[PDB]
Design a protein around this ligand. Structure first.
Ligand SMILES: [Zn+2]
Lengths: 190, 373, 191, 37, 65
């Protein structure tokens, strides 16, 4: 059935630190990387770990998702003892705001092709100023459902507390193509 | 070759047993048991008048070896050059043996130590320092061998017969005795090493620590009856006591190098007496009066001032000198060696310190409970 | 055709520094590993082979990789200036074998004993009993100077697999000019 | 026969692997080039 | 208490004062610094127990304790 607004992404502390560090390192150029983890259930997306991938001249795009590097790193991390599955992809938008462009849209449907519940994570490194982490998670809604008198996602609960989104996403068509997923960072006590 | 060793089979205890025994390994294209056997038979107690016979064989065994350990090779050539006793052509012999093995194997350092050893007898000053320097800089990247270090420190100890090698000889002898642990040499040699190290310490202008008097196993274990006074004197130089009775005791013996340096020895005794006397201070009344110094070092009250000045100038004291009261203020930056009783007492003091710290911490947390948050 | 992992154990002790075999035992053992790994990998190209040295250390210079080239690479410049520690060599061989990438490959160990083994009889028999309890096949082949047909080694291979097992061989080599043709007639064709 | 086969296989393997590294690094360089300049 | 990292370096020397040689691991001091992106990441990661950087009397007294 349709996804729920109560769905949220659990980002581990290590994953968030890795994504922010990679986003700052690749500035001003835009970087990207896979998001290892497990979906566990319908309402959760546990991002246990994220690993960076080599930067390609095409930028954040499907041709820059070189399967040799991804497959080698996946099998070899599982050899170390990290047998997660790809749940999405993070990418950097320095000074742009958390939103998806057309190329990001193509990458996101390519990701949804093999994993239906993939999540596209956008991080603004320069905008991630001290005391403010600008991070968002999106998943595409195809025009077929929303045009055909159907709500893109059912609000079965009150977890739609996510405040009014940044107007930059509105100008870049947030709700038109990609519903945003509310964020929830998971932190252990250790 | 078999005929050469047959005609020269003689000059060995049990004429067959000395040479045909290793020939048995030789015929079976073997070079590891054979090299150990020839090493042992070289160490066999003999005049080795057959050395002129062995060289050719060695040269023969050196012409198509391509397997023998270079370390064993140099260990045998050092004995060879010790036996032949022709320094004029020895130099060339060692040079050609060194050049015939130019690989990365670290046997060349032993040849450099050997050329230094045979060179410290003729022409021992101008360029022998260059030999020592190249040996020490080449002595890198592999400290676990412990034999090349032993040879280098043996050469350095050989250099001790120079005008300005007393403290440096002491340090290098310490390094050597660290490199070689077990006895592996006669009691006479070990006691001689301890003796020479002792006189290096007493005469060492740059050494007064003497922390290895009771910590170095060799000198502490050795010399219980044979001129044992040395360790006692060392104890005196770590006890700071007058003990000039022991100084004259070692003055009757070892007349050279000590009778002429009795003045410097007395100055050293006075300096270590100052060190000990302000070490025994209770750390709260660190000030020292003039009369105690004069009566302890048995020196005049006009010399304590210059003595403490010299001690401060060397870098073992960081105090100050007063004259109207003539009480020398004392602060310390020169530590010393400890002992079981001293360690027990000082750990008791540390326990008192930690108890006080804990008591004040408890008081602070109790009084500041609400504000703490 | 049988899926297996080959965990070869080569020697570079000082006892390999006498020309008992060929120019020297180093090239003899190098060609021996060459031919045995060749036989294993053309027998089955899906297999994998690695090497542990044994001279005073136990390095894993090549892990369990199907490409024999890396094993041939690290077999070079072995610099024989060490001492054999057989007690830990087979232990580290099994501990590296348990890192097998494939879970269907079978156990197979080849160790190059060129030096006499200084091991307690109880230690080697308990090692063999542990190998029995863990189902690991080990073939021991002897070169150079060595107490021929070691009682400890023959007991080790006898209790490596008892009561009608596969029969892990204890292979000895004839001293003098001899290649591994005897080492490939019986042991390589059938284990 | 030792020297010929030994060092031939040695330098052949090293050259082949290093040429593979050449090819991969060069391909990554060109894919990094792209356009525009 | 603190400092969960201990940095150690292998050294090799004759131990100067004539002692048998061994490998030994000489200690080198360590500290925890942060890069700006890591700094903002960690500060946002805590966001519930971070004490005021101004200190004030209560936190200075707890620092003394
Ligand atoms: Zn994008």
């Amino acid at each position: 059935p349709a996804v729920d607004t109560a769905e949220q992404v659990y980002i581990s502390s290590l994953a968030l630190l890795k994504m922010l560090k990679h986003g700052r390192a690749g500035v001003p150029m835009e970087v990207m990387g896979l998001m290892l983890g497990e979906f566990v259930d319908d309402y959760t997306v546990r991002v246990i770990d994220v690993f960076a991938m080599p930067q390609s001249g095409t930028g954040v795009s499907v041709e820059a998702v070189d399967p040799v590097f991804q497959a080698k790193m996946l099998d070899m991390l599982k050899q170390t003892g990290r047998p997660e599955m790809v749940v999405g992809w993070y990418h950097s938008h320095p000074g742009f705001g958390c939103w998806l462009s057309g190329v990001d849209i193509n990458t996101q449907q390519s990701f949804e092709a093999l994993s239906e519940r993939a999540v596209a994570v956008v991080v603004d490194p320069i905008q991630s100023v001290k005391g403010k982490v600008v991070i968002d998670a999106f998943r595409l809604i195809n025009a077929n459902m929303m045009v055909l008198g159907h709500e893109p996602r059912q609000t079965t609960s009150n977890l739609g507390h996510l405040n009014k989104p940044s107007i930059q996403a509105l100008i870049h068509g947030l709700n038109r193509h990609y519903y945003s997923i509310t964020i929830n960072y998971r932190k252990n006590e250790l | 070759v078999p005929g050469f060793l047959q005609q020269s089979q003689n000059s060995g205890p049990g004429q067959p047993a000395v040479w045909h025994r290793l020939e048995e390994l030789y015929t079976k294209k073997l070079w590891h048991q054979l090299t150990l056997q020839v090493l042992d038979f070289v160490q066999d107690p003999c005049f080795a008048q057959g050395d002129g016979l062995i060289k050719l064989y060695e040269n023969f065994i050196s012409e198509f070896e391509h397997r023998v350990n270079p370390l064993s090779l140099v260990e045998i050539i050092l004995h060879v050059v010790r036996q032949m006793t022709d320094p004029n052509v020895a130099l060339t012999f060692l040079e050609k043996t060194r050049e015939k093995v130019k690989s990365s194997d670290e046997a060349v350092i032993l040849c450099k130590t050997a050329i230094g050893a045979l060179k410290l007898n003729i022409g021992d000053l101008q360029v022998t320092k260059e030999t020592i320097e190249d040996v020490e800089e080449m002595l890198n990247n592999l400290p676990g061998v412990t034999s090349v270090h032993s040879r280098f420190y043996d050469l350095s100890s050989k250099y001790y017969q120079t005008i300005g090698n007393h403290a440096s000889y002491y340090k290098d002898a310490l390094r050597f005795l660290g490199c070689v642990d077990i006895k592996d040499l006669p009691v006479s040699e070990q006691q001689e090493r301890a003796f020479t190290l002792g006189l290096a310490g007493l005469l060492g202008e740059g050494v007064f620590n003497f922390g290895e008097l009771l910590m170095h196993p060799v000198l502490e274990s050795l010399r219980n009856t044979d001129r044992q006074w040395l360790i006692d004197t060392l104890y005196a130089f770590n006890s700071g006591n007058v003990e000039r009775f022991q100084t004259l005791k070692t003055a009757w013996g070892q007349q050279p190098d000590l009778a002429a340096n009795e003045a410097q020895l007395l100055r050293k005794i006075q300096l270590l007496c100052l060190m000990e006397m302000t070490f025994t201070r209770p750390a709260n009344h660190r000030q020292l009066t003039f009369e105690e110094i004069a009566k302890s070092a048995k020196i005049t009250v006009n010399e304590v001032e210059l003595l403490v000045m010299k001690a401060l100038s060397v870098g073992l004291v960081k105090g100050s000198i007063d004259e109207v009261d003539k009480r020398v203020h004392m602060t310390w930056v020169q530590p010393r060696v400890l002992d079981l009783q001293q360690i027990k007492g000082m750990k008791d003091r540390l326990e008192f310190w930690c108890t006080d710290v804990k008591s004040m911490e408890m008081l602070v947390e109790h009084q500041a409970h609400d504000i703490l948050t | 055709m049988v899926l297996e992992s080959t965990m070869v154990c080569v020697d570079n002790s000082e006892y390999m520094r006498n020309g008992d075999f060929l120019p020297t035992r180093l090239q003899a053992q190098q060609d021996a590993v060459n031919i045995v790994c060749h036989s294993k990998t053309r027998s089955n190209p899906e297999n994998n082979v690695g090497l542990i040295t044994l001279a005073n250390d136990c390095e894993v210079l090549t892990t369990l990789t199907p490409d024999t080239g890396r094993i041939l690479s690290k077999l070079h410049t072995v610099q024989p200036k060490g001492k054999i520690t057989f007690c830990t060599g087979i232990r580290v061989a099994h501990l590296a074998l348990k890192h097998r990438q494939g879970k269907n490959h079978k156990m197979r160990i080849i160790a190059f004993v060129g030096s006499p083994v200084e091991d307690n009889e109880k230690d080697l028999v308990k090692l063999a009993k542990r190998l029995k309890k863990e189902k690991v096949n080990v073939d021991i082949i002897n070169f150079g100077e060595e107490e021929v047909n070691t009682e400890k080694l023959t007991a080790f291979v006898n209790t490596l697999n008892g009561k009608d097992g596969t029969g892990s061989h204890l292979v000895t080599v004839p001293p003098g000019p001899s290649l591994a043709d005897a080492l490939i007639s019986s042991p390589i064709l059938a284990g | 026969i030792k020297i010929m086969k030994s060092e031939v296989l040695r330098v052949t393997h090293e050259l082949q692997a290093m040429k593979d590294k050449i090819k991969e690094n060069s391909e990554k360089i060109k894919v990094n080039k792209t356009l525009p300049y | 208490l603190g400092l969960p990292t201990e940095a150690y370096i292998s050294v090799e020397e004759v131990h100067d004062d004539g002692t048998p040689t061994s490998k030994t691991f000489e200690h080198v001091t360590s500290e925890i610094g942060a890069e700006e992106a890591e700094e903002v990441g960690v500060e946002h990661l805590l966001r519930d127990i971070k004490d005021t950087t101004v200190g004030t009397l209560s936190q200075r007294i707890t620092n003394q304790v």
